[PDB]
Design a protein around this ligand. Structure first.
Ligand code: MG
Ligand code: MG
Ligand code: MG
Ligand code: MG
Ligand code: MG
Ligand code: MG
Lengths: 138, 99, 208, 150, 125
RNA sequence: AUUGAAGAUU
RNA sequence: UGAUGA
RNA sequence: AAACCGGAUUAGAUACCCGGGUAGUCCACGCCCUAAACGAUGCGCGCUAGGUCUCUGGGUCUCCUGGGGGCCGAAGCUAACGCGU
RNA sequence: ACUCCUGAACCCGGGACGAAACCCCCGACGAGGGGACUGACGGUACCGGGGUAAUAGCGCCGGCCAACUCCGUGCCAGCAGCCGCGGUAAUACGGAGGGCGCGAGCGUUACCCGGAUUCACUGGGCGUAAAGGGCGUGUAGGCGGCCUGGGGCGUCCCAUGUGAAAGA
């Protein structure tokens, strides 16, 4: 049935970038969108937009890389080095504000969902609230 | 404050008494996952009033018997025989577990 | 406690001059002039290429052997230094350097640490006037370290304190030569000490 | 001139008609203690030419180690085969608390405060190779910023 | 295992076994001898090794090694036992403490004197 | 006696 | 079809 | 064709080879519940280059497009061997 | 060794705090003021004077692991935490010189945690290393696509009570 849609997205994304695709559809959900917004803003993706395919709502995700590279193996560095689900249907994961993780001494993000909406970790910390720890990303 | 618990009536087979199944759920100390867990309470129903399938509040009470220690505070909703159904089948699984 | 045995003899082995005698370890030997090599039947056969361990060992040996404080006591001071706030390698140095017996010597009242230690045990020293006979005594900043007026007479106190008339003293210390007394101004900054010793390696010896 | 420490020498052996035939392998690190290290694996009929040969390959294989005062930008774990290394940043005063293999490598990039763990297979060669890959993999605030601007 | 699985069964504590029923934990036990046989080692080892059968205050009767140059033990000898296998002699897992009870210390012993149980001798000392 | 030394062999 | 222990 | 009865072979031959032979192999009904019961690879779903052979549908039938069976092998994975829509 | 110097012990002299209340007197049996008795530790601690060069042991030195040489011994006697030493040249046995380590201690044995991501939540695996159930059906249970609204149980936040002393 597809059991964790948000896992899915992270994975679709993880997969498309390692073969350096320009873009990936992922079937669209409001929540998925909210996570994408962060990705976009935090400068991990170029951007994203709604689209249809076979006339059902998707989300094209435009991915983003580094420059062509030095010697044998000219593959660009990845912008999204690591994108990992934390909370999962098997095991939900929640943090109080005092215990939100700091991803790769701040060079990374942790999307995290609160009752004040979906936020990066600094975002959440600032508005002094915690919630479901969605994924890390660096 | 006298504890208030809310559950499902799964037995009226006793005079002035009801058995109430109260589910509780929480994060498992080591393994994290939110796990369910429940307990039946025998509660005081003096006007043999609440019946099989009612959802009720249960309130911490001055003792009535050995094991009667709660009284039926009120009714939340009637009908919920699915919940009783759940309990009953789980109960009958038990035969199909010995020798 | 404390060592007691052949000495300008590790002025040796540890590879480098420790002035443990002081008075002589200054003049055609810390024993170390005549034979700059390890002791015993084997000490001048070809150096064995020493292990990462060996190295760390000797280095702490070196440092400790300088203040002649015992392993038990040394270790306690180190653990003290670890858990304390700030850069643990240094602080440890500050702390060893705060031992009365060492300070008595840094002030020149004696010519060595082992000799200095005796003057402390034998009542010849005061701290802020009140007498103190503990080598291990922790000197804090602002403390005045006197010769005991009763002891001010002996051929030794004379000779050593006279010897100091010309002499310069620790940036972190002060010493009024005439009135036979010193002040402990501040604990020494790593830079103030010139110890033949890489402390980061000592820290490393107390890892595994 | 960089610094050069020998992490490992071993004697391997192959078989031929009547008798075995020995060889020597040498793991050598070279570093300027200022954010530049190299690993070198050199093998030869004799220890010296081997060690020496390592030296040569070490200098031909070098890394940007972005020190940030004694320590590294952030945490990394790297797997190399069954070998795994974790590298952790530390405030000054700590030291290089590592195993002999990555200590050697960290020390010669002039890392002075780092917390490490060897996990998985502890085989020196691969631990050393992971360590290098780990360092080779460190980014800094700057690089990230460049990457994400677009 | 899945996490549900760990919730269901959990991990299992690796709780492991003594090598030395000198029973009640006890760091030493007192026994009385029975045989003072000699035994051949195994492996690639050849020699005539000293052993006693010891009947213990544990209730237990077992074989123990008699360490050092030469002993003075026989049938009714009465001895303290310490644990320490022999490793060349499978089924020998306890040593006899030398210098306790009816076990003489090792005569003429200069070096590791503390084991073997022999007093500081007097010569030029 | 033999073996590097033994077991075995006169 | 066999080739005593290290 | 186990067993077993003989014939050879062999140092011997409770075996390999040869001549016989009962259970069994076959059927019905009831048991047994095992295996190198193997892809030594649990089941479902989503994602990630291609080439070529093949079974079986559909299309506008060079081909395109489903569902099986194969091999080679992007990225990747693996201790390696390998695995690889 | 030997020169000088200091002076643990030991001797002499002094000598505690710990104890100001109960009580009595004044006041008023109050408040407040005055007064007296009382020390097991103990002639101890501590202070002053005098003053003797005055105890060193245990473990270890093949590798891991810091520290090497000569005899003896000849798969013996023995060592041995694991790997392993000893078969006539033993840095591995026993002794000795020397050496390393710790020091009024040093070693041994037993037991607990560590290292052991070797029960793996943090943090493991199952083609050939140990590990896919012989295969299905489907009970409990676990898990559950996209949109909107209620509720607010989980979850998150603020305040507040609680979390004794010891310990840290
Ligand atoms: Mg792996
Ligand atoms: Mg392993
Ligand atoms: Mg054979
Ligand atoms: Mg042998
Ligand atoms: Mg495993
Ligand atoms: Mg298997």
């Amino acid at each position: 049935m597809l059991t964790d849609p948000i896992a899915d997205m992270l994975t679709r994304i993880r997969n498309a970038t390692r073969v350096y695709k320009e873009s990936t559809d992922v079937p669209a959900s409001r929540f998925k969108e909210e996570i994408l917004r962060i990705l976009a803003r935090e400068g991990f993706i170029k951007g994203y937009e709604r689209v249809d395919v076979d006339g059902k709502p998707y989300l094209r995700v435009y991915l983003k890389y580094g420059p062509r590279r030095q010697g044998p193996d000219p593959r660009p560095e990845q912008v999204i080095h690591h994108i990992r689900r934390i909370s999962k249907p098997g095991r939900r994961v929640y943090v109080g504000v005092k215990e939100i993780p700091r991803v790769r001494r701040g060079l990374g993000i942790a999307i995290l969902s609160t009752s004040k909406g979906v936020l990066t970790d600094r975002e959440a910390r600032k508005l002094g609230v915690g919630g479901e720890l969605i994924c890390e990303v660096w | 404050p006298k504890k208030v618990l809310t559950g499902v009536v799964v037995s009226d087979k006793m005079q002035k008494t009801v058995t109430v199944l109260v589910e509780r759920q929480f994060p498992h100390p080591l393994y994290g996952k939110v796990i369910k867990r429940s307990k039946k309470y025998l509660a005081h129903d003096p006007e043999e009033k609440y019946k099989l399938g009612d959802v009720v509040e249960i309130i911490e009470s001055r003792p009535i018997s050995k094991r009667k220690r709660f009284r039926v505070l009120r009714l939340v909703e009637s009908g919920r025989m699915d919940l009783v159904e759940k309990y009953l089948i789980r109960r009958q699984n038990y035969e199909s577990l010995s020798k | 406690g404390r060592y007691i045995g052949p000495v300008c003899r590790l002025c040796r082995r540890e590879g480098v001059k420790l002035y443990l005698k002081g008075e002589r370890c200054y003049s055609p030997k810390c024993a170390m002039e005549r034979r700059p090599y390890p002791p015993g039947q084997h000490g001048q056969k070809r150096a064995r290429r020493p292990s990462d361990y060996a190295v760390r060992l000797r280095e702490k040996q070196k440092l400790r052997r300088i203040y002649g404080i015992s392993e038990r006591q040394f270790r306690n001071l180190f653990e003290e230094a670890s858990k304390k706030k700030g850069v643990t390698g240094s602080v440890f140095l500050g702390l060893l350097e705060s031992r009365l017996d060492n300070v008595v010597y840094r002030l020149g009242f004696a010519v060595s640490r082992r000799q200095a230690r005796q003057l402390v045990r034998h009542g010849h020293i005061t701290v802020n006037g009140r007498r103190v006979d503990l080598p291990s005594y922790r000197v804090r900043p602002g403390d005045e370290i006197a010769v005991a007026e009763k002891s001010r007479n002996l051929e030794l106190i004379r000779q050593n304190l006279e010897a100091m008339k010309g002499r310069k003293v620790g940036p972190w210390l002060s010493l009024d030569v005439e009135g036979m007394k010193g002040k402990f101004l501040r604990l020494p900054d790593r830079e103030d000490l010139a110890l033949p010793v890489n402390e980061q390696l000592v820290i490393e010896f107390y890892s595994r | 001139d960089f610094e050069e420490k020998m992490i490992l020498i071993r004697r391997t052996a192959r078989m031929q008609a009547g008798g075995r035939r020995f060889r020597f392998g040498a793991l050598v690190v070279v570093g300027d203690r200022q954010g530049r290290v190299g690993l070198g694996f050199g093998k030869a009929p004799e220890v010296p030419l081997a060690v020496q040969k390592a030296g040569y390959y070490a200098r031909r294989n070098m890394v940007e180690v972005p020190l940030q005062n004694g320590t590294i930008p952030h945490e990394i774990e790297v797997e190399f085969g069954a070998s795994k290394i974790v590298l952790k940043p530390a405030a000054p005063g700590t030291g290089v608390i590592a195993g002999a293999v990555p200590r050697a490598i960290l020390e010669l990039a002039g890392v002075t405060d780092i917390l490490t763990k060897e996990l998985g297979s502890r085989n020196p060669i691969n631990i050393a190779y992971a360590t290098m890959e780990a360092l080779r993999q460190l980014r800094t605030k700057a690089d990230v910023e460049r990457l994400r601007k677009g | 295992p899945t996490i549900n699985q760990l919730v269901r069964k959990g991990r299992e504590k690796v709780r492991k076994k003594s090598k030395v029923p000198a029973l009640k934990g006890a760091p030493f036990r007192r026994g009385v001898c029975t045989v003072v046989r000699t035994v051949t080692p195994k492996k690639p080892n050849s020699a005539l090794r000293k052993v006693a059968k010891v009947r213990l205050t544990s209730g237990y009767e077992v074989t123990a090694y008699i360490p050092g140059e030469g002993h003075n033990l026989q049938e009714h000898s009465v001895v303290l036992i310490r644990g320490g296998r022999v490793k060349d002699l499978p089924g020998v897992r306890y040593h006899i403490v030398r210098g306790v009870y009816d076990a003489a210390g090792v005569k003429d012993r200069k070096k590791s004197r503390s084991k073997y149980g022999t007093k500081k001798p007097k010569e030029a000392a």
